[PDB]
């Protein structure tokens, strides 16, 4: 379900097969490192900083079902455990660097909860700037002073 | 000797190095997935639904011979053993599917005897539609109701 966006042979962010679309943050430079995915036609959406397309039939079995459901507590991401509370995702400062955009923040059942875009350093912890689902629609939470990763 | 034709990153058919030419069915969309082969100049022939070119000197050692000599009996092909009789090649129905075109039918000494183009389902067995060599010249045998693979 997770695929990596490469730019000049360098991983910039990620792409994800959620629902029946193929997502990847709009701000991420590069092209999905997967033939089938790379040749697709994406529809950009600057409001959501999202850029979706449709999953080829032969990969649709590979999608992951997202969720608006996110109760205060700890979430999972590649570098460790993210913490959600006060309507804000945070992590120990240093555990997220430029080149981590696109990486999903899963919950314990695998549902993608948000997609990292960058983070604002506020000391001990960094408030993440993410793309998250609302009641049904996409949204973007960007803490004051975020540094786009 | 066998090379695959790709189209939008998807295998459509095959290409084969037979004799001193490089073959691939004309109807197959895409370009041979091999630098040396892809840059060649092919001569189309709509009668034979064939599209040949000449094998670069550095690959000529990689060709597969051929022969007009084909006595009734069993021949060899990737999925098993083909049967020749009554001037017709056949196989157990189900053992050949779309995407098998281009695959050669060898004999027991390795000489390519025919090249599969598609097959007509006539029950228990399917009569193959092949490109075969006559006295010296190429020919195409297409059983009634063939389904072009």
Curated annotation (Swiss-Prot), chains A, B:
Start and end residues of each Peptidase S3 domain: 1-149
Residue positions of the active site: 27, 49, 101
Coiled coil: none
Region spans: Dimerization of the capsid protein: 71-81, 107-111
Disulfide cross-links: 1-16
Renumbered residue ranges of the record's region Interaction with spike glycoprotein E2: 43-48
Top-level lineage group: Viruses
UniProt motif Nuclear export signal: location: 32-42
Localization: Virion; Host cytoplasm; Host cell membrane; Host nucleus
Site residues by UniProt (Involved in dimerization of the capsid protein): 75, 108
Subunit structure of this chain's protein: Homodimer. Homomultimer. Interacts with host karyopherin KPNA4; this interaction allows the nuclear import of the viral capsid protein. Interacts with spike glycoprotein E2. Interacts with host IRAK1; the interaction leads to inhibition of IRAK1-dependent signaling.
Protein task: Forms an icosahedral capsid with a T=4 symmetry composed of 240 copies of the capsid protein surrounded by a lipid membrane through which penetrate 80 spikes composed of trimers of E1-E2 heterodimers. The capsid protein binds to the viral RNA genome at a site adjacent to a ribosome binding site for viral genome translation following genome release. Possesses a protease activity that results in its autocatalytic cleavage from the nascent structural protein.
Annotated domain remarks: The N-terminus contains a nuclear localization signal and a CRM1-mediated nuclear export signal. The C-terminus functions as a protease during translation to cleave itself from the translating structural polyprotein.
Protein name: Capsid protein
Native source organism of the sequence: Chikungunya virus (strain 37997)
